[PDB]
Amino acid sequence: VIKPEMKIKLRMEGAVNGHKFVIEGEGIGKPYEGTQTLDLTVKEGAPLPFSYDILTPAFNRAFTKYPKDIPDYFKQAFPEGYSWERSMTYEDQGICIATSDITMEGDCFFYKIRFDGTNFPPNGPVMQKKTLKWEPSTEKMYVRDGVLKGDVNMALLLEGGGHYRCDFKTTYKAKKDVRLPDAHEVDHRIEILSHDKDYNKVRLYEHAEARYSMLPSQ
């Protein structure tokens, strides 16, 4: 069902500190290698007055390299698909929440995404666009309420030095029952490969692989 190469189409709509926007995207990736590339285009609300980086993790764990001995919760969820719900709490009390509904048709994934953020300090790194990128991360996956949870300590590298921290909490909901995995980790590295000056057009890339702890047990 999930082919070695899968196309992507998405639409995001939302608001951040009052500013409304719409973004559409198209791309392609290799779900079994855990890699993907997206070309994103702002359709409404341009030019964005906030850091584009807060958006990028919202732009599909189907694109994750899973080893054989770990049930792949995400690929199992198709063709029916799945959704996720995510809260993103920044250390200066900025807060974002997002939802995505992910379906499938042929060799293409379709995302419908809602994104909302508020309470960002007007002179903070987000509203002043002082973020350079996300650090690579490790997301801890664990089961609760019969669905898969994901928690990851995220950090934005800042212009002029230092980091800006955010805690992600995600709930992944498959639309049909699947084999539930044991607790494990997912390494991430997301990064903007290119963009125009106002980030109206952005090329976005993620690499993800699932694994257990690399340390042995006594």
Q: Tell me, what CATH number does 119's domain have?
A: 2.40.155.10
Number of domains in the chain: 1
Q: Are 98 and 107 in contact (CB under 8 A)?
A: no
For 27, 44, 72, 194, the CA distances from 203, given in Å and listed in that order, are 9, 18, 27, 5
Structure tokens at 98: 């997002």
Structure tokens at 52: 């584009």
Per-residue three-class SS string for the chain: CCCCCEEEEEEEEEEECCEEEEEEEEEEEECCCCEEEEEEEEEECCCCCCCHHHCHHHCCCCCCECCCCCCCCCHHHCCCCEEEEEEEEECCCCEEEEEEEEEEECCEEEEEEEEEEECCCCCCCCCCCCEEEECCEEEEEEEECCEEEEEEEEEEEECCCCEEEEEEEEEEEECCCCCCCCCEEEEEEEEEEEECCCCCEEEEEEEEEEECCCCCCC
For this PDB entry, the determination method is X-ray
Quote the CA–CA distance of 159 and 162 in Å, as a whole number: 8
Tokens 């980790």 -> residue: 185
Residues of the domain holding 188? 1-218
Quote the CA–CA distance of 106 and 2 in Å, as a whole number: 9
Cβ atoms within 10 Å, residue 40? 24
